[PDB]
Amino acid sequence: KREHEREVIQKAIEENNNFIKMAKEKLAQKMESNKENREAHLAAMLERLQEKDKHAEEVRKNKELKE
Amino acid sequence: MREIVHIQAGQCGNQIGAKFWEVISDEHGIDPTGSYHGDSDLQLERINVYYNEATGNKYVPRAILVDLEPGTMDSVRSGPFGQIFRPDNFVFGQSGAGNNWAKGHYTEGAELVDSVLDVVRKESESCDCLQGFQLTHSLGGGTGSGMGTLLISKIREEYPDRIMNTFSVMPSPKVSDTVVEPYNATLSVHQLVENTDETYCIDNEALYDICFRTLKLTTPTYGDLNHLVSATMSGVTTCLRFPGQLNADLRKLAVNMVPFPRLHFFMPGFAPLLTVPELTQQMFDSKNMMAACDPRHGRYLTVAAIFRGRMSMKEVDEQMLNVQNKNSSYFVEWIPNNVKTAVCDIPPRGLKMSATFIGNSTAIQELFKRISEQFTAMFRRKAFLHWYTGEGMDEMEFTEAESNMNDLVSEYQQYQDATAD
Amino acid sequence: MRECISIHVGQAGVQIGNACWELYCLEHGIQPDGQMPSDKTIGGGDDSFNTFFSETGAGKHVPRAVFVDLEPTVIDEVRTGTYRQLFHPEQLITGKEDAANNYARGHYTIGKEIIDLVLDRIRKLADQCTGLQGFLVFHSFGGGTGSGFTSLLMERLSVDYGKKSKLEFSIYPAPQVSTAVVEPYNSILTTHTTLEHSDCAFMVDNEAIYDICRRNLDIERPTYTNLNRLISQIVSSITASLRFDGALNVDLTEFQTNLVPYPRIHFPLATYAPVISAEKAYHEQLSVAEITNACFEPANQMVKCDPRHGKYMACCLLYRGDVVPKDVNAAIATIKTKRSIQFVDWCPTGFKVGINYQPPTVVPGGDLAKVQRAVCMLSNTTAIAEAWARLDHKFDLMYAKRAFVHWYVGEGMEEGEFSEAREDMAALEKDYEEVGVDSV
Numbered sequence: 026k027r028e029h030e031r032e033v034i035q036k037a038i039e040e041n042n043n044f045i046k047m048a049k050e051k052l053a054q055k056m057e058s059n060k061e062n063r064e065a066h067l068a069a070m071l072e073r074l075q076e077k078d079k080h081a082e083e084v085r086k087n088k089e090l091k092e
Numbered sequence: 093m094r095e096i097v098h099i100q101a102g103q104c105g106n107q108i109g110a111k112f113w114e115v116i117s118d119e120h121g122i123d124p125t126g127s128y129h130g131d132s133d134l135q136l137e138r139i140n141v142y143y144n145e146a147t148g149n150k151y152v153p154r155a156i157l158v159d160l161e162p163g164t165m166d167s168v169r170s171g172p173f174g175q176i177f178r179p180d181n182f183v184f185g186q187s188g189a190g191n192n193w194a195k196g197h198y199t200e201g202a203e204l205v206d207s208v209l210d211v212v213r214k215e216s217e218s219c220d221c222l223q224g225f226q227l228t229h230s231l232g233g234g235t236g237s238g239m240g241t242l243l244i245s246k247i248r249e250e251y252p253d254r255i256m257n258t259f260s261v262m263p264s265p266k267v268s269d270t271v272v273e274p275y276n277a278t279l280s281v282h283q284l285v286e287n288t289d290e291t292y293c294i295d296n297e298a299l300y301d302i303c304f305r306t307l308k309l310t311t312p313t314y315g316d317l318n319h320l321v322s323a324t325m326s327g328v329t330t331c332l333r334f335p336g337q338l339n340a341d342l343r344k345l346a347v348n349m350v351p352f353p354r355l356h357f358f359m360p361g362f363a364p365l366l367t368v369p370e371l372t373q374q375m376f377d378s379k380n381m382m383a384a385c386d387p388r389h390g391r392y393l394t395v396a397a398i399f400r401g402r403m404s405m406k407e408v409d410e411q412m413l414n415v416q417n418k419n420s421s422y423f424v425e426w427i428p429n430n431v432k433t434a435v436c437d438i439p440p441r442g443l444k445m446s447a448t449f450i451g452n453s454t455a456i457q458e459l460f461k462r463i464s465e466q467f468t469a470m471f472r473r474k475a476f477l478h479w480y481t482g483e484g485m486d487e488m489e490f491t492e493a494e495s496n497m498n499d500l501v502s503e504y505q506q507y508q509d510a511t512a513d
Numbered sequence: 514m515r516e517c518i519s520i521h522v523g524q525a526g527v528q529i530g531n532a533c534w535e536l537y538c539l540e541h542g543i544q545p546d547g548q549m550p551s552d553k554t555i556g557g558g559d560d561s562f563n564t565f566f567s568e569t570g571a572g573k574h575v576p577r578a579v580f581v582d583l584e585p586t587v588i589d590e591v592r593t594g595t596y597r598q599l600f601h602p603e604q605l606i607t608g609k610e611d612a613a614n615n616y617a618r619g620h621y622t623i624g625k626e627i628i629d630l631v632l633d634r635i636r637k638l639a640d641q642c643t644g645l646q647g648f649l650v651f652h653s654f655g656g657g658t659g660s661g662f663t664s665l666l667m668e669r670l671s672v673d674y675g676k677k678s679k680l681e682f683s684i685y686p687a688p689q690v691s692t693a694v695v696e697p698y699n700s701i702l703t704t705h706t707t708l709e710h711s712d713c714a715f716m717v718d719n720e721a722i723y724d725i726c727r728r729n730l731d732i733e734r735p736t737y738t739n740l741n742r743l744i745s746q747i748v749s750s751i752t753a754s755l756r757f758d759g760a761l762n763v764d765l766t767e768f769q770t771n772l773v774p775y776p777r778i779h780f781p782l783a784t785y786a787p788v789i790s791a792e793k794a795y796h797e798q799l800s801v802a803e804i805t806n807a808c809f810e811p812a813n814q815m816v817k818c819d820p821r822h823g824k825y826m827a828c829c830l831l832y833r834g835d836v837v838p839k840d841v842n843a844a845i846a847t848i849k850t851k852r853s854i855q856f857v858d859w860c861p862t863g864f865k866v867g868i869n870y871q872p873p874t875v876v877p878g879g880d881l882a883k884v885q886r887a888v889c890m891l892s893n894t895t896a897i898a899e900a901w902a903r904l905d906h907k908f909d910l911m912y913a914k915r916a917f918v919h920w921y922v923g924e925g926m927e928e929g930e931f932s933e934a935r936e937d938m939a940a941l942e943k944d945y946e947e948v949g950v951d952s953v
């Protein structure tokens with residue numbers, strides 16, 4: 026009965042720890058995936074605004090080429 | 093404080109910008125000298141949204157005045173309140189744009205744009221917490237449409253996480269004969285669909301139809317039209333300027349109003365041009381819309397209603413429930429509770445009770461189809477393409493603006509036809 | 514010992530915290546400066562009110578509370594308002610830019626900028642406690658901060674404090690006072706994220722509180738001030754067992770044993786009586802039987818739903834004021850014969866009773882009549898699942914067309930988080946079905 030008593034309390038400890046651990050890792054996983062995502066949507070927004078500038082060079086280059 | 097940076101470009105842009113600052117300066121108790129001579133402390137609660145505080149207790153508009161031609165500039169200075177604007181915040185060219193969108197966007201405006209951007213940064217880096225920007229401009233001239241949309245994309249590159257809000261004036265053949273106007277409007281609409289978060293569609297064709305049919309003006313002037321505009325811009329910024337709960341800022345407006353990023357073109361309304369039921373019925377009537385589209389030809393994705401004055405809030409609640417109940421088929425059923433209303437206590441000058449209406453309706457496609465039809469009447473002939481190819485523009489750049497706006501109309505039709513089941 | 518720390522998140526949570534701590538101060542004779550002439554133990558003590566108030570050596574009784582909002586304007590009114598001397602400045606945390614009604618901004622973009630500071634401030638309160646019992650979290654379902662920041666906070670507290678209990682007071686949205694069309698999204702996301710991290714969650718349906726004010730208090734167009742003052746009375750009844758001593762005083766945790774039959778079934782239904790105006794309480798004394806009966810009238814519930822068409826898993830009666838067990842027992846006996854009270858077949862049908870003898874207080878210039886006796890009933894019924902059903906329906910209408918979903922994806926969230934959250938809600942509605950089926 027003593028060994029059973031220490032197993033039960035070891036199990037409660039082991040379960041509280043595993044819950045804290047998994048919440049800790051679930052969160053760091055979410056915060057990392059969310060940062061990547063937010064950064065990728067911004068980088069794609071800048072990438073195509075910067076294409077607008079390459080096309081604005083191309084258009085000013087034509088007005089001299091044609092004159 | 094949540095600051096907005098205000099930008100005025102071009103002929104139309106600067107004139108309607110001036111009357112906005114006159115009207116809200118008066119509502120906030122600020123004379124042409126930037127001094128507060130007001131009655132109540134509610135005029136100063138959120139005064140920092142549109143004003144910098146200069147010591148000597150001077151409130152200076154956080155406004156940037158821009159044009160490729162100095163004429164419009166010098167008129168603002170001598171105008172009422174001209175000496176309340178920061179002198180350094182005037183940025184003018186000389187060459188002008190000659191009503192050519194490619195001159196505003198690619199060539200002339202591109203030479204002046206980096207000079208406006210310098211002014212944006214000074215006002216922006218001086219902000220405790222920058223909400224974003226609001227542009228005023230026409231889509232039919234050259235500086236407002238072309239450089240106005242060039243400055244949008246440039247400002248978005250530097251502040252991609254700020255809200256970009258424009259008051260865009262749309263050309264009517266009833267207001268201007270400049271034949272190249274369906275080109276300019278279609279080319280900037282192509283830009284507005286990609287690069288703004290909210291656009292109030294201020295349709296000159298509706299302002300003309302209001303002045304003539306309702307107000308009964310046989311020859312309405314640009315001064316008559318801009319009276320309707322100033323009252324509308326004061327209406328739809330009331331929630332930004334006075335203490336309140338809903339749509340207190342530009343991002344919360346966008347989140348509540350824009351179910352899909354591209355469908356961000358709003359139909360504004362105003363009443364009177366009265367009891368609480370009459371106000372509610374009028375502000376929903378096609379005749380009080382500033383977008384020249386009949387709502388009963390589409391469906392509301394989302395609506396914002398601002399009531400101003402002293403009135404029973406129980407009564408406003410019941411009347412707004414009333415109009416949704418009896419007009420239920422004209423609100424999309426798959427967006428529950430898509431009509432919010434606000435009541436602010438201070439009415440506009442002159443009125444005891446006003447109502448301002450902001451609609452995201454699939455009937456705005458009516459406005460884009462009137463422009464698309466005038467665009468292709470010229471494009472299929474290749475009429476006036478030389479004013480554009482001469483600035484360096486490709487022909488399929490017109491094809492793309494066209495097909496993108498045709499796409500915007502198809503997507504409004506797509507969600508108007510959508511059902512819950 | 515047995516300290517509780519309150520955490521007030523976003524506009525609704527902060528403003529309901531104003532109402533509650535003002536009500537607590539009036540119940541305990543604490544002045545706006547924090548002095549309490551009755552506490553003769555200067556600088557400390559183990560009295561019942563010390564579960565909610567710490568004491569300085571200079572006689573001040575300080576709420577064990579943190580207020581958090583991602584913008585400053587709501588908490589600035591605490592900083593300058595009547596009770597500003599009550600709170601140490603470090604208990605009042607504000608950012609500069611709110612969540613804009615967006616759960617993603619509350620949980621990630623904005624809230625991640627203030628969460629360490631907030632956990633530091635909570636840690637400083639926890640380290641004053643000799644026997645910290647748990648947290649009370651107040652927040653709206655609907656705002657971007659109340660939803661997103663609260664659930665970021667709840668995850669972090671499970672990490673920093675393990676299984677230490679976390680109770681919620683959650684403002685469920687109503688169209689008459691809502692601020693965003695996206696409240697169903699925020700509601701479903703925070704409910705999904707918080708479910709594992711919360712032990713007990715008291716939902717308060719703004720439309721139920723709104724109807725009670727209109728109908729029982731004759732307020733034609735209730736304000737947040739009207740709603741909060743009624744809400745604080747319910748919160749006060751639930752916390753009175755922690756804050757007051759009494760022979761017949763049953764601890765909240767003991768009601769909790771009966772209220773939560775399975776971890777996920779942890780949303781008790783609250784019903785409060787009497788809610789009555791000064792004009793109408795005049796010359797009308799409401800007896801133990803009358804207020805007990807009012808608890809089985811669905812129009813008196815914190816949440817709109819019909820317990821007559823669900824099943825009970827528990828029924829607790831929290832009385833305060835002039836109430837003796839004999840009267841309670843008689844009132845209960847007549848309600849059983851005369852009322853529609855069906856229990857699931859797997860739990861006993863008794864009613865658990867607590868009586869706190871300190872009578873209810875009211876805040877000056879309120880609309881509630883000051884009465885001699887009050888009752889909060891906390892029941893666990895399958896009917897509360899109707900409120901999940903209503904919110905899940907609104908969520909589906911918009912999500913089927915992905916309306917507004919781009920605002921969340923732009924902030925770094927993925928669609929799979931929406932469907933994952935919605936499936937957890939489907940499974941939760943199914944759990945409420947299964948607990949109500951008879952055994953075999």
Ligand SMILES: Nc1nc2c(ncn2[C@@H]2O[C@H](COP(=O)(O)OP(=O)(O)OP(=O)(O)O)[C@@H](O)[C@H]2O)c(=O)[nH]1
Binds near residue numbers: 659737
């Ligand atoms: N009962 C009650 N409910 C409130 C109160 N204030 C806000 N709410 C509710 O909260 C919901 C919106 O969430 P809020 O708490 O206001 O938003 P927030 O927590 O400040 O988060 P943000 O969106 O970032 O501003 C609304 O639907 C209201 O019903 C209040 O004072 N009392």
Ligand SMILES: Nc1nc2c(ncn2[C@@H]2O[C@H](COP(=O)(O)OP(=O)(O)O)[C@@H](O)[C@H]2O)c(=O)[nH]1
Binds near residue numbers: 104105189231262317
């Ligand atoms: N409603 C209104 N529209 C205007 C005003 N001024 C110009 N417009 C419109 O703007 C178009 C021309 O653009 P414009 O303002 O001249 O651009 P800019 O000259 O470069 O600043 C015309 O089609 C007009 O209909 C005005 O004061 N009010």
Ligand SMILES: [Ca+2]
Binds near residue numbers: 553555560563
């Ligand atoms: Ca003591």
Ligand SMILES: [Mg+2]
Binds near residue numbers: 523524611612658
């Ligand atoms: Mg807020």
